[PDB]
Design a protein around this ligand. Structure first.
Ligand SMILES: O=C(Cc1cccs1)Nc1cc(B(O)O)cc(C(=O)O)c1
Ligand SMILES: O=C(Cc1cccs1)Nc1cc(B(O)O)cc(C(=O)O)c1
Length: 186
């Protein structure tokens, strides 16, 4: 099946806990995969205009590890629950992708999660202004704007609203699309 085939692809790139004990400032992100209309999509958040860091920009759900978290995957699920109302029984964490090093002292660990078909987002307005889906296949043929920095522009055909996706968020989206969709019969 489409979902079994995705999980089996993703597991080949799992690094597990290999980098999780290093003495960094630690953040986790959830890359949430949603199946709609026969196809896989990624879920993104638009950050609240009131935040200090990157107000109004597109990112994945996630945040800073705290003392209650059993492991880095726990961080990503706690934060997703608080930001968009995703409950733990509504997500299967499939793997841990390569972590991102930033500013010499910070390590961001990405987890890919398969989301329940009946989940419906409840954005927390203090953190999240908007939630939207992008088909995974978009990231193989993106509409690119050069700011030289590559920015993706995605227009949702439901309402005609255009979003900008860039930076680490754009990089991780393309990575997931390659892992799942490369070399497939049609
Ligand atoms: O950035 C996040 C995680 C999110 C990921 C997606 C939307 S929100 N939290 C945050 C930001 C800020 B800020 O930049 O002002 C202050 C806090 C806080 O602990 O108050 C917490
Ligand atoms: O999480 C982020 C930025 C992101 C990195 C990964 C995705 S979103 N900020 C943040 C700041 C603070 B703070 O002001 O100390 C507390 C948190 C938190 O999650 O508690 C979170």
């Amino acid at each position: 099946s489409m979902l079994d085939d995705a999980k089996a692809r993703l597991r080949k790139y799992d690094i597990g806990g290999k980098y999780s004990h290093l003495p960094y400032n630690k953040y986790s992100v959830l890359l949430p995969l949603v199946a709609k209309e026969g196809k896989l999509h990624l879920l993104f958040t638009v950050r609240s205009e009131k935040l200090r860091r990157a107000p109004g920009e597109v990112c994945f759900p996630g945040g800073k590890r705290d003392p209650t978290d059993m492991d880095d995957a726990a961080t990503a699920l706690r934060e997703a629950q608080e930001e968009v109302g995703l409950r733990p029984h509504q997500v299967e964490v499939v793997c841990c992708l390569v972590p991102c090093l930033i500013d010499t002292d910070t390590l961001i660990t990405p987890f890919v999660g398969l989301i329940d078909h009946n989940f419906q987002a409840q954005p927390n307005p203090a953190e999240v202004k908007d939630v939207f889906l992008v088909p995974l296949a978009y990231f193989l043929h993106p509409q690119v704007h050069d700011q030289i920095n590559h920015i993706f522009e995605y227009t949702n055909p439901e309402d005609g609203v255009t979003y900008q996706i860039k930076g680490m968020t754009a990089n991780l989206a393309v990575l997931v699309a390659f892992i799942i969709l490369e070399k497939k019969p049609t």
